[PDB]
Amino acid sequence: EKFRRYLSVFFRKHIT
Structure with missing residues:
Protein backbone atom coordinates (compact mmCIF):
# COMPACT_ATOMS: atom_id res chain seq x y z
CA GLU A 1 0.00 0.00 0.00
CA LYS A 2 0.97 3.66 -0.37
CA PHE A 3 -0.80 6.82 0.80
CA ARG A 4 2.12 9.21 1.29
CA ARG A 5 1.39 11.20 -1.86
CA TYR A 6 -1.63 13.22 -0.72
CA THR A 16 4.44 26.91 3.07
Missing part, protein backbone atom coordinates in the same frame (compact mmCIF):
# COMPACT_ATOMS: atom_id res chain seq x y z
CA LEU A 7 -0.27 14.49 2.60
CA SER A 8 2.98 15.30 0.79
CA VAL A 9 1.20 18.44 -0.39
CA PHE A 10 -1.44 18.73 2.33
CA PHE A 11 1.22 18.97 5.04
CA ARG A 12 2.35 22.20 3.39
CA LYS A 13 -0.33 23.93 5.45
CA HIS A 14 2.19 25.04 8.08
CA ILE A 15 5.40 26.56 6.73
Whole structure:
Protein backbone atom coordinates (compact mmCIF):
# COMPACT_ATOMS: atom_id res chain seq x y z
CA GLU A 1 0.00 0.00 0.00
CA LYS A 2 0.97 3.66 -0.37
CA PHE A 3 -0.80 6.82 0.80
CA ARG A 4 2.12 9.21 1.29
CA ARG A 5 1.39 11.20 -1.86
CA TYR A 6 -1.63 13.22 -0.72
CA LEU A 7 -0.27 14.49 2.60
CA SER A 8 2.98 15.30 0.79
CA VAL A 9 1.20 18.44 -0.39
CA PHE A 10 -1.44 18.73 2.33
CA PHE A 11 1.22 18.97 5.04
CA ARG A 12 2.35 22.20 3.39
CA LYS A 13 -0.33 23.93 5.45
CA HIS A 14 2.19 25.04 8.08
CA ILE A 15 5.40 26.56 6.73
CA THR A 16 4.44 26.91 3.07
